């Protein structure tokens, strides 16, 4: 009566109390092993004997694990609990073709970081205002698709249709997509836009040549240190004016999941039930509260999201606003054709900024993109 759990690196101690509570309530023992979330899929394929009963993963890999038969639909009991307690965006993270396969525990989104000695709060709600009054820095020469890929969805185009599950639904090859490429190209002559490399985002923020930039919670500490805690502002993504339309700038949402792999239980339904119970425990309000407090995990649970501790933390509050609605975030699609998206979107965004494609080529390149990705 032992089940194996894979938890994110560093996290084991954070979860000790949660696990003890589960152990005391279920009478199962839990073997807890740290293991990198992004590698869970590879690890399972390589050695299914050693595979954990319960493991953390990023939702962007959930579609693959479903399609290989590794993760099965959760029991209806848990489906109801997850839908009730999670944000709608988090649930979309946990679902694939209409079924729930995992338990959200966390969310992540990029935000706008700015220097309060260079920009007032009032002036960071609009990209046009930011670059009129100060500077915005981005890595446009070597485009980051995670960062600026969502511009295409910001203007009302989709990545694999509205639900992110139609392999033929990506529709950038139109005037709105072309207008995204135009805006990219225009940033080269926008006097408030500063062309960055990955390795100088933070240092140019520190030296004051970049007043603002977009990144995730992983850069929060470095931003703080670059200009001083008291000078660091955090805000939601601004509006941006593309093709003469002012629209909300979107980012991707990442949803952090626990899932159950039934295979190591070999038909033992008592143990499978225990595995779902563990996942439920790991991702309930109490655990998410503890995970925010100990490891600054931004909760997927609506109730913890609105807690004073979380709402008083400007980074967490901002990530939550971004994850609160599809007005701000696109939940990263799960289809394997995302592979093409990463490669081709980066190249086209780069080429538009660098002038390796011209305006008269924007539409044909985007139409070709739409064809390529639909394979």
Residue numbers in the entry: 39 to 413
From the paper:
Shelburne et al. previously showed that the knockout of the maltodextrin-binding protein gene did not suppress streptococcal growth in a nutrient-rich medium and that the protein played an essential role in bacterial growth in human saliva. Among the virulence factors in GAS that can be targeted, proteins involved in complex carbohydrate catabolism have been implicated in pathogen infectivity.
The crystal structure of SPs0871 in the absence of a ligand was determined at 2.20 Å. Three aromatic residues critical for ligand binding (Y184, W256, and W380) lined one side of the binding pocket, similar to the structure of other maltodextrin-binding proteins. The 6 of 16 residues in MalE1 that were identified in previous studies as being involved in ligand interactions are conserved in SPs0871. Given that other maltodextrin-binding proteins have been reported to adopt a closed conformation upon sugar binding, SPs0871 is likely to undergo a similar conformational change. Maltodextrin-binding proteins are thought to exist in the unbound conformation without ligands, and ligand binding drives the protein into the sugar-bound form. Virtual screening with the two conformations followed by in vitro screening yielded a hit compound (95,186) that competed with the ligand and was derived from the hit library for the unbound form. Therefore, it is likely that 95,186 favorably binds to the unbound form. When we performed additional docking calculations using the Glide docking program (Schrodinger, New York, NY, USA) to identify hotspot residues for the compound binding, E146 and K294 were predicted to form hydrogen bonds and W256 was predicted to form van der Waals interactions during compound binding.
